[PDB]
């Protein structure tokens, strides 16, 4: 028995936490990511990269802590601890935001390790690997948003920061600078996510309300056995209910569950395509016909033009504090504002 | 045998292709009314003075909108919460200028969706089902009522209702963040957990079932033909699915009970949408999200900013620019 | 006014949810199918097809 | 050379439900993208 | 409105070509 097969035996043993071959990628990298997040939000400042407090040590709370993105002066430098910026100095590495590429790259490799774990356990158990294929949606979102978007921009600075309010900032940033609500790729993502939530709710409620009486208790949960061969709920009654209520219904359980996979994964992939567009400032910002009409006719107003004015105001009022490296000095008189506000 | 009993038997009939029921007697007229008026107004309604400042906003397709920018614009701020049916206008053109179609569509739609919920109960009762699908549908109903009724009531104007359009919806969201910081509101945070998690659990459940389907076909035909409608047997191996997922994380994180799992699937996004509907319904009374502006000060007392302060700068930009001719006074109090 | 109004709106909403839950369950329990569909006397299996 | 019949041929199917789903997908994609095509 | 001159043909073809593909495949089903 060779050493490879003996190691394969040990890694694939049935134990509380399955390791596998993929765990060699998954478990250190994820532990580097999450601990790297938990360290940063507890201890590490963004004062030299952002002019912001972002740790519990500085007085921020769970909503306001972040592992913030690096300083814009580094560009897309990978910011290794041994790299030409920190030069092995741990404290300087923390201060320049090296924890952001630490968490983002260990997270990337950890997500790769998790998908590899899905494939490995699917092969060892004996099932089809559709859980891994479904997990490609979150990988597409992570890769587009945290890697491809700042790579198209000036630096890692404009990547989302690993925090609650930092993510909120990134969200509002893409509104005011990219009009990301107006992007059909995002609108398809919203359709997919809200549709997946709808499908989750409607499928769970439909199953729980077409259950067969297979027990005597009012507690219906114990009338199910995992080794039973029969369906625990009526597909026929559910189909008749939704056909008379809604007009159409599922008649095929396999298509139901594939659709439950398909909707939010397709939403994630489409929104990722839009984010790749925003990486190069290829925005759905304007409808040029409505802009030319509004420029020549000052009675024409739509909700689209109102949103354009909203984005203009947010950009001008947010940019000096959000991009402190640019040294935007906007005097009070140049800020767009309506009457009395 | 009576005519009324025959009509009661037809209305409550399970043999109807679309179930009517007594809730349907209210839902069908209201939803048809709101649908007809919405389609006509979305195509052809003249501009509406939504802010009450004689600055009419064009919402319909024929007045230069596209599908994205088009909307049925909310009623005038001059109207406020006043009831504005067609017969209280001196002409149809005045009713159109003041945003009457919004009030007509919204009021009928809201009646229609409450009767849709009741009709869901009613058909579940006539089919011998358990009755709680309507409880799950109460979460989108609560959210629709929050944005179309409850937030206008709290703010004192239907003009503050979500417009019936795509870009009008975006305008509503952005102004709402400017005025309420809904992103920093823990109930929206539960909504987001509701929809993100609901999509996660939709994908996991669908992926686990599709992963564990019983071999009943060839690889030429679609796997969905391995299921027959009305078949008694289960079409996937729940034990294989559980044996996969309890090794993906660990054994007791995995549902071995299909009823428990389906309950969790139903309950999680319903509870999340209930919470975010209450967030919008409570921000109607201006109980806003968390304010951490200048929460951190240095030992001297100089402000040390956080991400909340940068978010607040973004909120200012929206706020000082929105409804830019409407305000005459220093505070946006409603 | 804000605290009292928000509280009671939320309370009122969740008590409507509770009304729907207990009314629906009261109807099903009085009609005898609150514990699920009986497999032998499933009502849809005796109904004609819709189309 | 002979023109022999290929045995690897298979019929293609698209059932009516799949046609309705596809037509709805095409129509809503047109609804979504038409405004951007017109710009 | 000063819309894109190719917008109408792009919209009609973007709808019509997959509509035609689906109709072709549906009508031939059962052969």
């Amino acid at each position: 028995r060779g050493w490879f097969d003996v190691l394969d035996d040990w890694l694939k043993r049935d134990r509380f936490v399955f390791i596998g071959w993929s765990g060699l990628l998954l478990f250190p990298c994820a532990f580097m990511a999450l601990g790297g997040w938990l360290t940063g939000t507890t201890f590490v400042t963004s004062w030299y990269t952002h002019g912001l407090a972002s740790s519990y040590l500085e007085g921020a709370n769970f909503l306001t802590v972040a592992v913030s993105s690096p300083a814009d002066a580094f560009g897309h430098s990978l910011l290794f601890l041994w790299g030409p910026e920190a030069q092995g100095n741990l404290t300087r590495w923390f201060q320049i935001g090296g924890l952001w590429p630490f968490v983002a790259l260990h997270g990337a490799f950890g997500l790769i390790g998790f998908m590899l774990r899905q494939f490995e356990i699917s092969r060892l158990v004996g099932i089809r690997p559709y859980n891994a294929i479904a997990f490609s949606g979150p990988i597409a979102v992570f890769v587009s948003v945290f890697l491809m978007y700042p790579l198209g921009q000036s630096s890692w600075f404009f990547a989302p920061s690993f925090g609650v309010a930092g993510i909120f900032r990134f969200i509002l940033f893409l509104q005011g600078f990219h009009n990301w609500t107006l992007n059909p790729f995002h609108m398809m993502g919203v359709a997919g996510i809200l549709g997946g939530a709808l499908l989750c709710a409607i499928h769970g409620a439909t199953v729980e309300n077409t259950l067969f009486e297979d027990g005597e208790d009012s507690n219906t949960f114990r009338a199910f056995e995992p080794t039973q061969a029969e369906e625990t709920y009526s597909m026929v009654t559910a189909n008749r209910f939704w056909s008379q209520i809604f007009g159409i219904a599922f008649s095929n359980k396999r298509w139901l569950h594939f659709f439950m996979l398909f909707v939010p994964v397709t939403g994630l992939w489409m929104s990722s395509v839009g984010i790749v567009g925003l990486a190069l400032n290829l925005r759905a910002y304007d409808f040029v016909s409505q802009e030319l009409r509004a420029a020549e006719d000052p009675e024409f107003e739509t909700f689209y033009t109102a949103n354009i004015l909203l984005n203009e105001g947010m950009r001008a009022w947010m940019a000096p504090q959000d991009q402190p490296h640019e040294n935007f000095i906007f005097p009070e008189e140049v800020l767009p504002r309506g009457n009395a506000l | 045998a009576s005519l009324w009993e025959q009509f009661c038997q037809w209305v409550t009939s399970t043999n109807n292709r679309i179930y009517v029921g007594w809730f349907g007697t209210l839902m069908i007229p209201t939803l048809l009314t709101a649908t007809t008026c919405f389609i006509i107004a979305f195509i052809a309604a003249p501009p509406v003075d939504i802010d009450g400042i004689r600055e009419p906003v064009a919402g319909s397709l024929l007045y230069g909108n596209n599908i994205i920018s088009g909307a049925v614009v909310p009623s005038s701020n001059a109207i406020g919460l006043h009831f504005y049916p067609i017969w209280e206008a001196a002409s149809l053109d005045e009713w159109l200028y003041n945003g009457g179609p919004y009030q007509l569509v919204v009021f009928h739609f809201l009646i229609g969706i409450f009767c849709y919920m009741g009709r869901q109960w009613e058909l579940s009762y006539r089919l011998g089902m358990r009755p709680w699908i309507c409880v799950a549908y109460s979460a989108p109903v609560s959210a629709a009522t929050a944005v179309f009724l409850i937030y206008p009531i709290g703010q004192g104007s239907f003009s503050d209702g979500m417009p019936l359009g795509i870009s009008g919806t975006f305008n509503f969201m952005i102004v709402f963040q400017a005025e309420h910081n809904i992103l920093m509101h823990p109930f929206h945070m539960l909504g987001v957990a509701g929809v993100f998690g609901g999509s996660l659990f939709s994908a996991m459940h669908g992926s686990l079932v599709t992963s564990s389907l019983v071999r009943e076909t060839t690889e030429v035909e679609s796997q969905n033909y391995g299921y027959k409608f009305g078949q008694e047997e289960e079409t996937y191996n729940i034990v294989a699915a559980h044996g996969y997922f309890g090794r993906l994380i660990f054994q007791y994180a995995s549902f071995n009970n299909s009823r428990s799992l389906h309950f969790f699937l139903g309950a999680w996004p319903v509870i999340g949408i209930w919470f975010t509907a209450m967030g919008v319904s409570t921000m109607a009374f201006n109980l806003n999200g968390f304010n951490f502006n200048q929460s951190i000060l240095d030992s001297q007392g100089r402000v040390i900013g956080t991400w909340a302060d940068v978010l607040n700068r973004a909120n200012i930009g929206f706020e000082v620019m929105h409804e830019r001719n409407a305000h005459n006074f220093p505070l946006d109090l409603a | 006014r804000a605290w009292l109004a928000t509280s009671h709106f939320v309370l009122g909403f969740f008590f409507l949810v509770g009304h729907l839950w207990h009314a629906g369950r009261a109807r099903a329990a009085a009609a005898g199918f609150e514990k699920g569909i009986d497999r032998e006397t499933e009502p849809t299996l005796f109904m004609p097809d819709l189309d | 050379m002979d023109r022999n019949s290929n045995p690897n041929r298979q019929p293609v199917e698209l059932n009516r439900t799949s046609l309705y789903l596809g037509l709805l997908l095409v129509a809503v994609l047109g609804i979504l993208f038409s405004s951007y095509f017109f710009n | 409105m000063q819309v894109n001159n190719l917008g109408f043909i792009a919209s009609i073809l973007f709808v019509l070509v997959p509509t035609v593909f689906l109709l072709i495949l549906f009508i031939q089903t059962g052969k």
């Binding site: 056909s243 007009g247 159409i248 | 009305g230 | - | 037509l23 709805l24 | 819309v3 109408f8």
Partner: peptide, 30 residues
């Protein structure tokens, strides 16, 4: 004339909804 295209795509979607409900493939137990 872009309004004609918008009306056409919305009408196509609504007509597909009508035909998908009223002339659906009927579910049959076999």
């Amino acid at each position: 004339m872009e309004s004609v295209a918008y009306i056409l795509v919305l009408t196509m979607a609504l007509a597909v909804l009508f035909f998908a409900i009223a002339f659906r493939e009927p579910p049959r137990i076999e």
